[PDB]
Every structure is written in C-alpha cells, then in structure tokens.
From Swiss-Prot:
It comes from the Eukaryota. Changing C169A: Significantly higher kinase activity. It comes from Homo sapiens (Human). Residues 14-268 form the Protein kinase domain. Changing V28E: Strongly reduced autophosphorylation and kinase activity. Homodimer in the presence of bound dimeric VEGFA, VEGFC or VEGFD ligands; monomeric in the absence of bound ligands. Can also form heterodimers with FLT1/VEGFR1 and KDR/VEGFR2. Interacts (tyrosine phosphorylated) with LFYN, NCK1, PLCG1. Interacts (tyrosine-phosphorylated active form preferentially) with DAB2IP (via C2 domain and active form preferentially); the interaction occurs at the late phase of VEGFA response and inhibits KDR/VEGFR2 activity. Interacts with SHBSH2D2A/TSAD, GRB2, MYOF, CBL and PDCD6. (Microbial infection) Interacts with HIV-1 Tat. Detected in cornea (at protein level). Widely expressed. The chain holds residues 821 to 1168 of 1356 of the full protein. Changing P253S: In HCI; somatic mutation. This is Vascular endothelial growth factor receptor 2.
C-alpha cells in the first residue's frame, strides 16, 4: 500500500521546466520543488509525468514504478525518490533527485581529449573509470538485495551527479545489452543484468562508444552471441577489466559473477590502480 503522509507532494509547489527525455508513456522533465525536503528550500528535481491522453496500462506502469521506488529506498548510487503527485486534480507525477551532468555515455564521449591513465586538471584517469564501474556495481548489489531487476542496465541509464558520484536510474528492443537467455527464452533475472553490466563496462572503457561497432543487429548477430562470439577489448581497458567483461558475458547465467563478487573485485582493482 501507498503511504500518502510520507510521499504526497502538492502540484502547486512544483514549477515544471526543461525536458530531459520523451517516451510513449509521457516525458521526463526538470522542475523546481519548493519545500520537498520537509523545509522551505528550493530543490531541482526530475519529474516523470503522464500525457493528457493516457492509457490505464500507462497509469499502472507509472504507479508500479512509484511502488518499486518506495520499496528500493535510499542508496548513494541509485536515484532517490523525493515525492509523488497521485491525488486527483492533475496528472500522475513521480519525483526523484535531479542529476545535473546527464548520462555517463554522453559525459565520457566529451572527455576523450581529456584522458591520461594516471597523474604522477578536468581529466579522466583509469581510477575514475574503475570508480564509476565500482559505484554502479554497488547500486546494482543494493537493487539485488531489494530483490529488484533493472531490465535496461546501460550507460544511458547511468547518471552523473556532483563529486564524481554516479546513480542508477531508468528513463523508460535494447538487443545489444540483452543476455542470450533474455533474447532466446525471455528470462529476466539478476544474472541477465550481470551480462548488461559487462556491456556497460565496455561502454565505460571505450569512453562512451556504441557496443558492437558496425555490426548489424538482427538474427545473425543473435546466432553469433549464442555461438559464443564476444566484443573485442575496448581502447581504454586494463587486461583485468576486459576479463571481468568476459566473466559477465559467460553463456551460462549461473557461471557469471554476482554483483557482490563484482563489488569486491572492482574495489580491489581501485586499490591496485593506486
Ligand atoms: O529513474 C527513474 N525511475 C526509476 C524507475 C525504475 C527503476 C529505477 C532505478 F534504476 F533506480 F532502479 C529508477 C526516474 C523517475 C522519475 C523521473 C526521472 C527518472 N529518471 C531520469 C532522471 C533524469 C535526470 N535526473 C534524475 C533522473
């Protein structure tokens, strides 16, 4: 059940602004929420709202997401729920903390000319890339502990906040990030998200490059994946990091590492890079 006293926010205390994403359900927009932090301050927030012409299935989907977000709770590497507009008088709105710097893929592409493996300014290092990977693994380990499956784990869903802090989100087909059991059997598990994490590692260590470059996405691509074909090492990877991708891309879901194993593994690589 939904706790109104804890999550209900007044529509009049919200000032909608610049759009961030657009889907068939509605849109993600940037807004200013006045006194959302049990105070009288102004906070910039991200709002997911339904269009005027909305399906009952669309309303159920946004309500489910609100319930999933209430269930998740707070974690530093997961977008935090601040409120909701569920009461009649306007459209259904889901309010989360805003991430100013956008998605990691777009950010890393803008920093290709600003990369050095290590410092002996506004530059990325190997430590940064391992840190982002580590933070995503931590947030995914938390989602697994709350018995949640992401369904769309990709760099476009990894947002960057202040102090190099990355947060897992969901703006919502994405065959490049999909595990073989998800394509061929439609099985969605936490182990199929491990496969997606491997693709996300490739995105991080290629500095925002698109997975499977120049490869046609169809039936042949799918048959090659099932046959054991894998992506070659990206341009900015370490040998250990590429092996971690290959472990995530194991054909058998049970033979892939868990997010808890990846947290420990990436945590040690961060130490070893120093
Ligand atoms: O991400 C949202 N919901 C969500 C749903 C399911 C799972 C998870 C997860 F990933 F956290 F488990 C998160 C979300 C909700 C409301 C508005 C924007 C949203 N995202 C885009 C955004 C853009 C800029 N700044 C912050 C966020």
């Amino acid at each position: 059940p939904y706790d109104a006293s804890k999550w209900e926010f007044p529509r009049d205390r919200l000032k909608l602004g610049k759009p961030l994403g657009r889907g068939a359900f509605g849109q993600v927009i940037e807004a200013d929420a006045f006194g959302i932090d049990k105070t009288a301050t102004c906070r910039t927030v991200a709002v997911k709202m339904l269009k005027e012409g909305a399906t009952h299935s669309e309303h159920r989907a946004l309500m489910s997401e609100l319930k999933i977000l209430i269930h998740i709770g707070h974690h530093l590497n997961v977008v935090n729920l601040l409120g909701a507009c569920t009461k009649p008088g306007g459209p259904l709105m889901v309010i989360v903390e805003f991430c100013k710097f956008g998605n990691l893929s777009t950010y890393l592409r803008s920093k290709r000319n600003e990369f050095v493996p290590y410092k002996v300014k506004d530059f990325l290092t190997l430590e940064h890339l391992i840190c982002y990977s580590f933070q995503v693994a931590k947030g995914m380990e938390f989602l697994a502990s709350r018995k949640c499956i992401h369904r769309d784990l990709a760099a476009r869903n990894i947002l960057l906040s202040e102090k190099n802090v990355v947060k897992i989100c969901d703006f919502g087909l994405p065959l490049k990030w999909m595990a073989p059991e998800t394509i061929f059997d439609r099985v969605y598990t936490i182990q199929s998200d491990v496969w997606s994490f491997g693709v996300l590692l490739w995105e991080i260590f290629s500095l925002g490059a698109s997975p499977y470059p120049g490869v046609k996405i169809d039936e042949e691509f799918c048959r090659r994946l099932k046959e054991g074909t894998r992506m070659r090492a990206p341009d900015y990877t370490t040998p250990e990091m590429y092996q971690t991708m290959l472990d995530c891309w194991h054909g058998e879901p049970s033979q892939r590492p868990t997010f808890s194993e990846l947290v420990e593994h990436l945590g040690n690589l961060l130490q070893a890079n120093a």
